[PDB]
A paper describes a structure:
Two PGL proteins, PGL-1 and PGL-3, are key scaffolding proteins required for proper P granule assembly. PGL proteins can self-assemble into granules, both in vitro using purified recombinant protein9,11,12 and in intestinal nematode cells or mammalian cells in culture when expressed on their own. These in vitro PGL granules display liquid droplet behavior, indicating that PGL protein alone is sufficient to recapitulate the biophysical properties of P granules in nematode cells. Assays for granule assembly in mammalian cells implicated the conserved N-terminal region of PGL as critical, and structural studies identified a central dimerization domain (DD) within that conserved region.
The NtDD has a novel fold consisting of 11 alpha helices and a single N-terminal beta strand. While each ASU possessed two pairs of identical interfaces, one of these interface pairs consisted of a network of conserved amino acid side chains making extensive salt bridges and hydrogen bonds. We conclude that the dimers observed in the crystal structure represent the NtDD dimer detected in solution.
Residue numbers in the entry:
A (entry chain A): 5 to 215
B (entry chain C): 1 to 109, 117 to 215
Write the structure that this text describes.
Amino acid sequence: KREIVEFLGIRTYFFPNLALYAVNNDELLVSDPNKANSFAAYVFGASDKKPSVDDIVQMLFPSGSDSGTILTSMDTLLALGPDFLTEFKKRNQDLARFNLTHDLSILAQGDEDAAKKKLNLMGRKAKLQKTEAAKILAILIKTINSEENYEKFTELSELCGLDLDFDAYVFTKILGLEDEDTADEVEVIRDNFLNRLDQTKPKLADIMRNG
Amino acid sequence: MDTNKREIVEFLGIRTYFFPNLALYAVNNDELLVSDPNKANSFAAYVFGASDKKPSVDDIVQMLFPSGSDSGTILTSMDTLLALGPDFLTEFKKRNQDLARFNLTHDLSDAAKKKLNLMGRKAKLQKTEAAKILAILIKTINSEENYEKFTELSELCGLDLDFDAYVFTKILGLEDEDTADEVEVIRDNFLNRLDQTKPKLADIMRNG
Ligand SMILES: [Cl-]
């Protein structure tokens, strides 16, 4: 089941290992950020150096990941876009040996366009269900089916309705969705997250707010 | 109510922002809707499936603005008039002129639609029901065709305002071959609440 989790003021669906990293390496990020993980340091505003694709994959799929971790991170791969589809397919092929699969596997099976029209209708009905799990699936589908970056940002912004502002912000940062057309909205998303992080980790929040 | 703030209200299982007088009417008059629907209110009878006669603009306005409405009731019902489109804008302007004598006004009183669009996007990101309702209203107003308008009104279900989404779908004629399966989900969400408090209303809406 798609389940939101929380780590000491960081509420997340898509990025649980990144949230855990920030819990475990708070002092490092605040006091010696050039020793910290590059993906974490970039997200939290402690470095302007961009993470590599490999940095992202290793944070999503740490050694020893179990099937639940893998399935959740495969959702994140889909949200990040076609750059990550080969990684998604490799992870899905491995799961099949255990009789497991990602529930949106039709996206990896050719005729992607036809699958996305069917998924569009599925996602619209999922959003009308009353569970967090269904609403996450709906947002994921709408994000996958977005062509342009402004549309992708608009659909990912719906994560804030589930108090997943952290995830919306991480996607914005990693996918480069902040520009002149979206900057004022990105500021609201960032501030929503920081208003919560201030309550548990104010020094880390201060880095993110300033530097 | 005697407040400027947008507030969701509830009456016996019926949660609503845009149609509080209609919700209360149905709670008070469910047996009449069952047993003598032609003598019941025509707007209520149409929404709940007791009659296929469409209400008039005047029937709808009278339900939204009953005798004795206070300022919050007027302001809320003015939101409803905006979402109901061009046949209701003259009434909106009449009501807004009344309010000005008391130093009150509706807060939304191509260029304006772009400014409104940016305002609605930032409102949706706030953490209050009042801001989310405003955002949905703006997105509805700025919609240019029925399928887009239905898509934006559907967001009301995210605030458990399925009743309002259903009423708008019925009055604006938004149920068609493209939207019918989604309309069924909205209807079923509302029926799920009704089955627990007004089984009679649920039965009419399912049967007749
Ligand atoms: Cl879609």
